[PDB]
Protein backbone atom coordinates (compact mmCIF):
# COMPACT_ATOMS: atom_id res chain seq x y z
CA UNK A 1 0.00 0.00 0.00
CA UNK A 2 1.12 3.49 -0.92
CA UNK A 3 -0.13 5.72 1.85
CA UNK A 4 -1.12 9.31 1.40
CA UNK A 5 1.04 11.88 3.24
CA UNK A 6 -1.71 12.94 5.62
CA UNK A 7 -2.84 9.27 5.84
CA UNK A 8 0.60 8.05 6.88
CA UNK A 9 0.95 10.98 9.34
CA UNK A 10 -2.32 9.98 11.08
CA UNK A 11 -1.27 6.29 11.21
CA UNK A 12 2.15 7.19 12.57
CA UNK A 13 0.60 9.57 15.09
CA UNK A 14 -1.73 6.83 16.39
CA UNK A 15 1.28 4.51 16.55
CA UNK A 16 2.94 6.90 19.03
CA UNK A 17 5.65 8.37 16.84
CA UNK A 18 4.86 12.04 17.67
CA UNK A 19 7.59 13.56 19.84
CA UNK A 20 8.99 9.99 20.21
CA UNK A 21 12.39 10.41 21.86
CA UNK A 22 11.59 14.01 20.99
CA UNK A 23 11.15 13.61 17.24
CA UNK A 24 8.16 15.55 16.06
CA UNK A 25 6.01 13.54 13.68
CA UNK A 26 7.16 15.43 10.56
CA UNK A 27 10.50 13.70 10.88
CA UNK A 28 8.82 10.33 10.52
CA UNK A 29 6.68 11.34 7.52
CA UNK A 30 9.67 12.84 5.69
CA UNK A 31 11.90 9.84 6.40
CA UNK A 32 9.15 7.51 5.09
CA UNK A 33 8.74 9.70 2.02
CA UNK A 34 12.36 9.71 0.94
CA UNK A 35 12.97 6.12 2.10
CA UNK A 36 10.05 4.30 0.43
CA UNK A 37 7.84 7.00 -1.19
CA UNK A 38 5.15 5.78 1.26
CA UNK A 39 5.08 2.36 -0.33
CA UNK A 40 4.91 -0.29 2.37
CA UNK A 41 6.11 -2.88 -0.09
CA UNK A 42 9.26 -1.28 -1.34
CA UNK A 43 12.33 -3.50 -1.18
CA UNK A 44 15.72 -2.50 -2.42
CA UNK A 45 18.43 -5.06 -2.77
CA UNK A 46 21.84 -3.75 -1.80
CA UNK A 47 25.35 -4.54 -3.16
CA UNK A 48 26.24 -6.59 -0.13
CA UNK A 49 23.30 -8.93 -0.78
CA UNK A 50 21.18 -7.35 1.97
CA UNK A 51 17.82 -5.72 1.19
CA UNK A 52 15.93 -2.76 2.54
CA UNK A 53 12.30 -3.53 3.42
CA UNK A 54 9.12 -1.61 3.92
CA UNK A 55 7.99 1.94 4.47
CA UNK A 56 11.05 2.87 6.50
CA UNK A 57 13.42 0.72 4.44
CA UNK A 58 14.73 -1.41 7.31
CA UNK A 59 17.86 -3.38 6.45
CA UNK A 60 18.44 -7.23 6.62
CA UNK A 61 22.09 -7.58 7.78
CA UNK A 62 21.20 -5.91 11.06
CA UNK A 63 17.50 -5.34 11.82
CA UNK A 64 15.45 -8.16 10.38
CA UNK A 65 16.03 -11.67 9.12
CA UNK A 66 15.04 -12.24 5.59
CA UNK A 67 16.83 -15.58 5.14
CA UNK A 68 19.07 -14.60 2.18
CA UNK A 69 21.44 -12.27 4.03
CA UNK A 70 24.64 -13.71 5.56
CA UNK A 71 25.30 -12.59 9.11
CA UNK A 72 21.90 -11.02 9.71
CA UNK A 73 22.17 -9.60 13.19
CA UNK A 74 18.37 -9.36 13.08
CA UNK A 75 18.40 -6.83 15.98
CA UNK A 76 14.62 -6.34 15.72
CA UNK A 77 14.01 -10.10 16.16
CA UNK A 78 11.52 -10.07 13.35
CA UNK A 79 11.22 -11.45 9.82
CA UNK A 80 11.71 -8.81 7.14
CA UNK A 81 8.48 -9.99 5.56
CA UNK A 82 6.55 -8.60 8.59
CA UNK A 83 7.64 -5.12 7.42
CA UNK A 84 6.00 -5.27 3.99
CA UNK A 85 2.51 -5.22 5.57
CA UNK A 86 -0.05 -2.44 5.01
CA UNK A 87 -0.18 -2.26 8.75
CA UNK A 88 2.82 -0.22 9.81
CA UNK A 89 2.86 -1.65 13.37
CA UNK A 90 5.90 -3.91 12.97
CA UNK A 91 7.82 -1.27 11.05
CA UNK A 92 6.92 1.35 13.66
CA UNK A 93 7.82 -1.11 16.43
CA UNK A 94 11.24 -1.71 14.94
CA UNK A 95 11.84 1.98 14.02
CA UNK A 96 11.44 2.71 17.73
CA UNK A 97 14.15 0.21 18.72
CA UNK A 98 16.54 1.62 16.16
CA UNK A 99 15.89 5.11 17.50
CA UNK A 100 15.81 4.23 21.20
CA UNK A 101 19.08 2.27 20.82
CA UNK A 102 20.85 5.64 20.55
CA UNK A 103 21.23 5.65 16.77
CA UNK A 104 18.84 8.57 16.48
CA UNK A 105 17.12 9.27 13.18
CA UNK A 106 20.48 9.39 11.58
CA UNK A 107 19.96 5.65 11.18
CA UNK A 108 17.89 6.70 8.18
CA UNK A 109 20.07 7.82 5.39
CA UNK A 110 17.15 9.46 3.63
CA UNK A 111 16.21 11.45 6.79
CA UNK A 112 19.79 12.59 7.43
CA UNK A 113 19.96 13.62 3.75
CA UNK A 114 16.52 15.04 2.90
CA UNK A 115 15.03 16.06 6.29
CA UNK A 116 17.61 16.83 8.98
CA UNK A 117 17.69 20.61 9.46
CA UNK A 118 14.72 21.27 7.15
CA UNK A 119 11.23 22.49 8.08
CA UNK A 120 9.98 18.97 8.79
CA UNK A 121 6.60 20.11 10.14
CA UNK A 122 5.85 21.03 6.54
CA UNK A 123 5.25 17.31 6.23
CA UNK A 124 2.27 17.24 8.56
CA UNK A 125 0.72 20.71 8.14
CA UNK A 126 -2.72 20.54 6.53
CA UNK A 127 -3.87 17.13 7.87
Amino acid at each position, epitope marked *: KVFGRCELAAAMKRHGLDNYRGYSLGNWVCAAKFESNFNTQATNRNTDGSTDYGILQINSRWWCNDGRTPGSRNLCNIPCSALLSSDITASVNCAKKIVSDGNGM*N*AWVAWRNRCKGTDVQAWIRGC
Partner: nanobody
Amino acid sequence: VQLQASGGGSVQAGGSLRLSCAASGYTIGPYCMGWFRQAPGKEREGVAAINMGGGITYYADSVKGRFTISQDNAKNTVYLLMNSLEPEDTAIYYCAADSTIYASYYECGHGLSTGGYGYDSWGQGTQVTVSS
Protein backbone atom coordinates in the same frame (compact mmCIF):
# COMPACT_ATOMS: atom_id res chain seq x y z
CA VAL B 1 34.90 1.77 22.86
CA GLN B 2 38.57 1.46 21.95
CA LEU B 3 40.41 1.51 18.61
CA GLN B 4 43.99 0.26 18.62
CA ALA B 5 46.05 0.63 15.46
CA SER B 6 49.25 -1.33 14.76
CA GLY B 7 51.73 -1.30 11.92
CA GLY B 8 53.29 1.71 10.35
CA GLY B 9 56.97 2.66 10.51
CA SER B 10 59.44 3.49 7.75
CA VAL B 11 60.04 1.82 4.47
CA GLN B 12 61.67 2.63 1.21
CA ALA B 13 59.66 4.06 -1.64
CA GLY B 14 58.21 1.06 -3.50
CA GLY B 15 57.87 -1.20 -0.50
CA SER B 16 54.73 -2.15 1.36
CA LEU B 17 53.37 -1.86 4.90
CA ARG B 18 50.40 -3.34 6.71
CA LEU B 19 48.34 -1.43 9.28
CA SER B 20 45.70 -2.98 11.56
CA CYS B 21 42.94 -1.81 13.82
CA ALA B 22 40.91 -3.65 16.36
CA ALA B 23 37.78 -1.97 17.73
CA SER B 24 37.22 -3.02 21.32
CA GLY B 25 34.40 -2.47 23.73
CA TYR B 26 31.62 -2.84 21.18
CA THR B 27 28.46 -4.74 21.81
CA ILE B 28 27.15 -3.99 18.30
CA GLY B 29 29.17 -2.67 15.42
CA PRO B 30 30.94 -0.67 14.24
CA TYR B 31 28.99 -0.25 11.02
CA CYS B 32 32.10 1.26 9.38
CA MET B 33 35.90 1.18 9.98
CA GLY B 34 38.20 3.19 7.73
CA TRP B 35 41.49 5.02 7.52
CA PHE B 36 42.27 8.72 7.36
CA ARG B 37 45.66 10.30 6.94
CA GLN B 38 47.13 13.72 7.73
CA ALA B 39 50.12 14.32 5.49
CA PRO B 40 52.36 17.15 6.64
CA GLY B 41 50.99 20.46 5.40
CA LYS B 42 48.02 18.96 3.58
CA GLU B 43 44.31 18.30 4.15
CA ARG B 44 43.13 15.27 6.06
CA GLU B 45 42.51 12.57 3.49
CA GLY B 46 39.93 9.82 3.64
CA VAL B 47 41.88 6.76 2.43
CA ALA B 48 39.81 3.64 2.62
CA ALA B 49 36.68 2.23 4.35
CA ILE B 50 34.86 -1.03 4.60
CA ASN B 51 31.31 -1.76 5.55
CA MET B 52 31.64 -4.10 8.55
CA GLY B 53 30.17 -7.50 7.87
CA GLY B 54 28.76 -6.67 4.48
CA GLY B 55 32.36 -6.16 3.38
CA ILE B 56 31.95 -3.39 0.77
CA THR B 57 35.09 -1.28 0.30
CA TYR B 58 35.79 2.25 -0.92
CA TYR B 59 39.13 3.90 -1.63
CA ALA B 60 40.36 7.42 -2.20
CA ASP B 61 41.25 8.00 -5.84
CA SER B 62 44.90 8.53 -4.96
CA VAL B 63 45.30 5.16 -3.29
CA LYS B 64 43.09 3.31 -5.67
CA GLY B 65 44.88 0.25 -6.97
CA ARG B 66 47.61 0.28 -4.34
CA PHE B 67 45.83 -0.07 -1.02
CA THR B 68 43.46 -2.83 0.03
CA ILE B 69 41.32 -2.82 3.17
CA SER B 70 39.91 -6.01 4.64
CA GLN B 71 38.51 -7.38 7.90
CA ASP B 72 39.48 -10.28 10.16
CA ASN B 73 36.15 -9.92 12.01
CA ALA B 74 36.63 -11.13 15.62
CA LYS B 75 37.18 -7.93 17.64
CA ASN B 76 36.15 -5.78 14.65
CA THR B 77 39.70 -5.89 13.31
CA VAL B 78 40.60 -4.56 9.82
CA TYR B 79 43.84 -4.16 7.81
CA LEU B 80 45.15 -1.90 5.18
CA LEU B 81 47.77 -3.48 2.95
CA MET B 82 49.74 -0.66 1.33
CA ASN B 83 51.81 -1.58 -1.74
CA SER B 84 53.76 0.64 -4.13
CA LEU B 85 54.33 3.08 -1.31
CA GLU B 86 55.60 6.44 -2.61
CA PRO B 87 56.98 9.25 -0.42
CA GLU B 88 53.73 11.20 -1.03
CA ASP B 89 52.10 8.54 1.18
CA THR B 90 54.14 9.83 4.17
CA ALA B 91 51.58 10.88 6.78
CA ILE B 92 49.90 10.14 10.09
CA TYR B 93 47.38 7.35 9.65
CA TYR B 94 44.30 7.31 11.76
CA CYS B 95 41.83 4.52 12.24
CA ALA B 96 38.17 5.47 12.59
CA ALA B 97 34.82 3.73 13.18
CA ASP B 98 31.18 4.79 12.61
CA SER B 99 29.23 3.39 15.57
CA THR B 100 25.71 4.01 14.21
CA ILE B 101 23.78 0.95 13.17
CA TYR B 102 21.92 2.42 10.20
CA ALA B 103 18.34 1.35 9.52
CA SER B 104 18.67 1.66 5.79
CA TYR B 105 21.78 0.76 3.82
CA TYR B 106 24.73 3.12 4.32
CA GLU B 107 27.81 3.03 2.11
CA CYS B 108 30.77 3.79 4.41
CA GLY B 109 32.83 5.57 1.80
CA HIS B 110 30.14 8.27 2.00
CA GLY B 111 31.29 9.74 5.32
CA LEU B 112 34.91 9.06 4.39
CA SER B 113 34.83 11.15 1.22
CA THR B 114 32.92 13.98 2.93
CA GLY B 115 35.04 15.03 5.88
CA GLY B 116 34.75 11.86 7.97
CA TYR B 117 31.07 12.42 8.79
CA GLY B 118 29.67 9.67 10.91
CA TYR B 119 33.07 8.37 11.96
CA ASP B 120 32.80 9.13 15.64
CA SER B 121 35.41 6.90 17.20
CA TRP B 122 39.00 7.59 16.48
CA GLY B 123 42.24 5.94 17.33
CA GLN B 124 45.81 6.93 17.97
CA GLY B 125 47.69 8.03 14.86
CA THR B 126 50.49 5.95 13.44
CA GLN B 127 53.21 7.64 11.40
CA VAL B 128 54.23 6.02 8.19
CA THR B 129 57.27 7.48 6.52
CA VAL B 130 58.31 6.50 3.04
CA SER B 131 62.09 6.90 2.42
CA SER B 132 64.16 7.93 -0.62
